[PDB]
Every structure is written in structure tokens, then in C-alpha cells.
């Protein structure tokens, strides 16, 4: 019915506190759950209800710093959590060598992203080490892996790489030419972007692709006007009321951001139907515990709560900050990041 | 060996074979964030896992420990990596590991780590003999599982197994002509074998799609395929298509058809066609039909398209 702002604020507060053993599968990616919650509070202008200082220390304890002999540069970045059992060290002393300890691209991304949201200035971030680690993750085809030990590679990680380079304001972290090639090669016959060449185009990968190009500032350069028109068509066809991620699939709240943000970057979100979208998103709101679910009368989670709110933000919901569609942080945060970049250039 | 729910299950801290190892606990510092609470049993397994990892112990007991860690949480990518390290060190029977992962994936078909693990195994064995059947089983519980289709394309390409895919595709399109994943697979097979440059193939495909469209006219996937295989050749270069579509409009109408027409007319305008000002009017007329009555939800979009055509061809 209406936006239960306070309820959602408590929801995110709880997420930062303690989770039931039934969310153990998120252990190695707790940092992204932190992001969903922090960025979600930021989006609701409630970052005051948390101790920015404690959380900043926690995040820094997750950074994989290079060792004395700088022999582990290709493995630096951030961890999803402390699951490896390394002694709590908030980026103070050097690096305590460990056979299997290394960063995860999605954690380096959400980590830096969280630090900026909390006001930190990234002075304790070994920028060169992170960039070195990033480079190590890129494959011949231009895409990226999540960890140096090996993993699947797709558009999700291309977006992570792009965000990292953007925030550290240094693109030496990737071979941009090859990344762009990968993004082009992922365009389907139906004109959407897929996780990789030949695969079914999808709302999530289309967002990752388009947002990556925007972050590099090369959308126009990479896709022709005819091409962009075709992509726009594929994207806007995703709205049913709310948005689905693929043709002939039921809608899901989070696509209101994935696809909506893409439409925004392509400058035609304004031509979508706001009311039906807003109504759907709200219909998935959990009026009892707060947060949003993928479908109405479904269990809520951090991911849908955050993206449902960002989806609402795209339409300027009363009480929600404007979201930076490509960086996935509040404009306030994106602005603060600009100030930060300026200060460095001295 | 010893199941996690066996009446006689024993914590690792109470097992004689593990007495020489000092368990390593996880610490999130003074003020923990998004901290997950773990049961005695769960924390026990992982406290020993950390210990074994930290020492890179390539032992048989470590290998068995991973099975338990994976049961507690199959999304821990580090556990899977270490298990692979052990598979090599202990030179374990990979054919058996295939059975293991085959079961794990059936219970967790949307997990990234399990699909990655299976792919590494198939690469090691250079044996794709059981892949297509396995994937078909998974696609049977969820015909749109992205992980399954992704793996299926990898196998088919890596070991060149195209011989029966187009037939598999035809079968699934019969089971559900609306499955967007299957239409994508169809284009994957064809463009990687015969290609679409053979006028005979193009004709077979355009004809096949129109047949499917006639069966279920309101199917975005079918229309997207039809437009997909022709858009780069030039929609205006197929005069009989334009009329065959206009003939469907009477009964088999849908926003997809109307849209296709608009795209045909636009290709014409883009190619200095005859009676330009007349074509543009035919287009605009359709854009408005879409906005006002056929695809109302995209009302502002279609009118936006209309304004675009006018300011470009006048």
C-alpha cells in the first residue's frame, strides 16, 4: 500500500546484527550482505543508526594485504568474511601468509563500496595491491574470475572489475579493450546482453554490461545508435507491471533495479509505466518484518529489500535518495566519491 | 563415512584420529557485522577445516572432512577448491567424484560452485559421455535453469557434440513453445553448425518460426527469434514477409506482430524506399495503435518511437 520506511530501516539494522544458522550459505559473502544493509540504510538516510567506526574496522580486517616479500600481490583484495580463521587485523600489521587466503572480486567491490558509504577515505586501502589482484583475474577473452585459485567467469565479474577501477579511479586494473570486446560478444540475436557469448540474454547481465560501459564512459563508442535502439527495445519489453529478467518469466522485484537502472542509463526509463512498477514493488513488501521479497507474500531478504528500494528510488519515492544507476550507491555517495578523487589529485 | 545425522556421529574434537590437530576458530573482532550463529556441530566441522587448510594438509582424513564441510555449506568455494587439490594429491578415482557431484547438483541446481566443480572434472577426464543426459535430467526439473544451459553449451562446444542438439531443441519447444531458453539454444546450434547464410536454412527457420507463431501468436520468444535471424540481412529485403504478416494481423494479431511491422517499415525508410512519406505514415499509425490500445503499458515508449521516426524522415 504505502512505503513502510521505518520498518525497512529496522530490517537492515537487524541484518547488520545477527543472522540465523539458516543463512550459513552466505558466510563467504557476508560482506555483500553488509553492503545491501549499509547501502540500503544510506538510501533511506539512516546511516546514523549504526557505528560507522566499528564497521569500518571490521571491513578493513577483511583486506588481504601484501606480505613483507610482496610475493602474494596477485591475491590481494578483500575477503567475504573471516571464515578462514585469520586473526582479526584491521589493516594494521603486514600480511600473515596463508596457503589459501586471497581476495574475491565481488568482495573487493562491495568492500570498497561499503567503506565509501561509511565515510572512510580509503587511505588504508593498498590501492596498487588491489589493482594488481584485479589484473590477475582477467582472462584472455576479456572477462574475469572471482578468485585467483579459479572460478567461473562471466559478466557479473566484469561489472565488479569496472566498479573497482572506477572507485579507485584507476583503470590499470583491467585491459579495457578486451573487456569491451567481451561485452560486445555477449549481445544476443534478440539484442539483450547475456552472461557470455551464445548464452540467453538476461536482465542481470544486460545491466552489468551496460553499466560497465557507462562506468568506462564508452557506451556511445561501443554501440551504434541502431544497436542502442535494439537494446533499449529489449530492455523496455521486460516490464509486465513489475519487471522480469527474461522473456516469458514471472516478474521479480529486484529486476525493477537491474532492468530499470539499465533503462535509466539508456535515458528512456522516463517512458516506462511508473505506477504499475511502483505498485508491484510495494506488493512484495513484508508489512510485518520489513524488507521486500521477490514476489508478494514471499519471504523477504537483504537482496530484494535493497534492490526493491533502489527500484523505488529510480522513480523518486518520497523518502528515498536518488540512486546512481551505474555505480549502485546513493548519488550522495557517488558525489562524496568525486570529492575524494579530487583530493587525491594533488 | 560417518554421516552428520548418524546416531553415532562424533564431534571431531572427540575423535582420536584428530587428537593431534588444534582447531582454528573464526573471529570477527570486537564488534561483528552480519554474524551468522552456528550450531555446536557446524562450528566443530569448520574449526577443524580451518586447521587442515591452514596447514595445507593433503591427507585422507582431510578429504573426508571436506565432504562434511560441503554438506554443511556447498557454497563455500574455498572448500571445493581444497577438495580439488586433494583429489589430485591423493589421486582419487575421478569417476567416483562424478557420481558425488552428480548427486550434489541435483539437490542444489542453482549453486555456482557445484557446476564449476563438475566442469573442472569433465575437463580432467576429457570425458563428456554422460553430460548431455545429466543436463537433460536437471532441465527436466527446471527447463530454464541458466546454469544447466550454460554447462550444456560448454560441453557441446568443447567436445563438438552438435549432432543431436537441434533435435533436442525441437522436442523441448514442443513441450513448451514459450521457453525462451530453448529458442536461444536453437539459435546457438544453428549458428554454430550450418549458419544462416544458406538461403535454404534461413527459409526452413523462418518457416518453422511462423508455424510456431501461428500456434501461439502471443509469444515474445518466437518473434524475437524471427526478427533476430533477419534483422541483420535487412527486414525490408523480404517483400513476401511483409505481406504474410499483414495477413496474420486479422486474427493472429499481437503487439509483437505490430512491432515487427513497425520495424519493417523503419528498415524501408532507412533504405530510401519508394513512397517514403507514405511508409512513415503507415509506421506512425502503428506506433499509435500500440500506444493507445495494443501495448498500452509502453504507451510513452511507442509515442517516443513515433516522434523519433517523424523527426528522422520528413
Amino acid at each position: 500500500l504505502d512505503f513502510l520506511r521505518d520498518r525497512h530501516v529496522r530490517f537492515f539494522q537487524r541484518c547488520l546484527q545477527v543472522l540465523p544458522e539458516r543463512y550459513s550459505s552466505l558466510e563467504t559473502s557476508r560482506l555483500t550482505i553488509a553492503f545491501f544493509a549499509l547501502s540500503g540504510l544510506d538510501m533511506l538516510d539512516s546511516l546514523d543508526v549504526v557505528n560507522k567506526d566499528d564497521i569500518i574496522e571490521w571491513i578493513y580486517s577483511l583486506q588481504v594485504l601484501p606480505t613483507e616479500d610482496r610475493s602474494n600481490l596477485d591475491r590481494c583484495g578483500f575477503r567475504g568474511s573471516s571464515y578462514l580463521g585469520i586473526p582479526f587485523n584491521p589493516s594494521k600489521n603486514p600480511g600473515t601468509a596463508h596457503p589459501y587466503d586471497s581476495g574475491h572480486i565481488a568482495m573487493t567491490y562491495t568492500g570498497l563500496s561499503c567503506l565509501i558509504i561509511l565515510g572512510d577515505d580509503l587511505s588504508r586501502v593498498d590501492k596498487e595491491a588491489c589493482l594488481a589482484g584485479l589484473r590477475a583475474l582477467q582472462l584472455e577473452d576479456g572477462s574475469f574470475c572471482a578468485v585467483p585459485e579459479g572460478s567461473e567467469n562471466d559478466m557479473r565479474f566484469v561489472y565488479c572489475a569496472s566498479c573497482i577501477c572506477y572507485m579507485l579511479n584507476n583503470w590499470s586494473g583491467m585491459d579495457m579493450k578486451k573487456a569491451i570486446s567481451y561485452i560486445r560478444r555477449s549481445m544476443s540475436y534478440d539484442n539483450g546482453l547475456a552472461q557470455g557469448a551464445g548464452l540467453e540474454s538476461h536482465g542481470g547481465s544486460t545491466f552489468c554490461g551496460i553499466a560497465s560501459l557507462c562506468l568506462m564512459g564508452k557506451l556511445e563508442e561501443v554501440f551504434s545508435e541502431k544497436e542502442l535502439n535494439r537494446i533499449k527495445r529489449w530492455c523496455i519489453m521486460r516490464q509486465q507491471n513489475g519487471y522480469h529478467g527474461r522473456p516469458n518469466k514471472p516478474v521479480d522485484t529486484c529486476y525493477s533495479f537491474w532492468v530499470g537502472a539499465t533503462l535509466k542509463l539508456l535515458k528512456i526509463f522516463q517512458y516506462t509505466n511508473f505506477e504499475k512498477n511502483r505498485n508491484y514493488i510495494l506488493s512484495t513488501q513484508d508489512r510485518l518484518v520489513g524488507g521486500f521479497a521477490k514476489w508478494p507474500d514471499s519471504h523477504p531478504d537483504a537482496l530484494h529489500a535493497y534492490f526493491g528500494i533502489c527500484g523505488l528510488s529510480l522513480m523518486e519515492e518520497s523518502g528515498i535518495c536518488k540512486v546512481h544507476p551505474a555505480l549502485n550507491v546513493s548519488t550522495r555517495t557517488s558525489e562524496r566519491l568525486r570529492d575524494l578523487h579530487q583530493s587525491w589529485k594533488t | 563415512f560417518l554421516s552428520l545425522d548418524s546416531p553415532t556421529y562424533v564431534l571431531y574434537r572427540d575423535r582420536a584420529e584428530w587428537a593431534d590437530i588444534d582447531p582454528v576458530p573464526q573471529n570477527d573482532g570486537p564488534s561483528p557485522v552480519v554474524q551468522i550463529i552456528y550450531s555446536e556441530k557446524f562450528r566443530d566441522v569448520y574449526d577443524y577445516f580451518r586447521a587442515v587448510l591452514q596447514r595445507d594438509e593433503r591427507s585422507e582424513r582431510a578429504f573426508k572432512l571436506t565432504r562434511d564441510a560441503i554438506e554443511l555449506n556447498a557454497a563455500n568455494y574455498t572448500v571445493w577448491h581444497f577438495r580439488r587439490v586433494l583429489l589430485r594429491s591423493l589421486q582419487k578415482d575421478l569417476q567416483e567424484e562424478m557420481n558425488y557431484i552428480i548427486a550434489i547438483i541435483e539437490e542444489q541446481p542453482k549453486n555456482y560452485q557445484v557446476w564449476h566443480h563438475r566442469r573442472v572434472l569433465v575437463e580432467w577426464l576429457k570425458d563428456p559421455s554422460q553430460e548431455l543426459e545429466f543436463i537433460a535430467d536437471i532441465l527436466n526439473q527446471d527447463a530454464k535453469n541458466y546454469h544447466a544451459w550454460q554447462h550444456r553449451q560448454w560441453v557441446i562446444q568443447e567436445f563438438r557434440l552438435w549432432d543431436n542438439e537441434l533435435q533436442y531443441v525441437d522436442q523441448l519447444l514442443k513441450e513448451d513453445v514459450r521457453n525462451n531458453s530453448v529458442w536461444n539454444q536453437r539459435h546457438f546450434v544453428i549458428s554454430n553448425t550450418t549458419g544462416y547464410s544458406d538461403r535454404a536454412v534461413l527459409e526452413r527457420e523462418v518457416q518453422y518460426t511462423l508455424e510456431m507463431i501461428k500456434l501461439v501468436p502471443h509469444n515474445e520468444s518466437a518473434w524475437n527469434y524471427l526478427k533476430g535471424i533477419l534483422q541483420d540481412r535487412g527486414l525490408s529485403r523480404y517483400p513476401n514477409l511483409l505481406n504474410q504478416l499483414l495477413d496474420l494481423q486479422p486474427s493472429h494479431s499481437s503487439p509483437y506482430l505490430i512491432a515487427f511491422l513497425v520495424d519493417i517499415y523503419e528498415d524501408m525508410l532507412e533504405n530510401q524506399c519508394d513512397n517514403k512519406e507514405d511508409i512513415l505514415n503507415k509506421a506512425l499509425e502503428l506506433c499509435e495503435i500500440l500506444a493507445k490500445e495494443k501495448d498500452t503499458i509502453r504507451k510513452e515508449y511507442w509515442r517516443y518511437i513515433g516522434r523519433s521516426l517523424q523527426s528522422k524522415h520528413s
Binding site: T32, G204, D252, L303 | -
Partner: peptide, 6 residues
């Protein structure tokens, strides 16, 4: 149910 992104 839920959406797996990692």
C-alpha cells in the same frame, strides 16, 4: 524462492 548471485 531466493536468488543466487554468487
Amino acid at each position: 524462492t531466493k536468488c543466487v548471485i554468487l
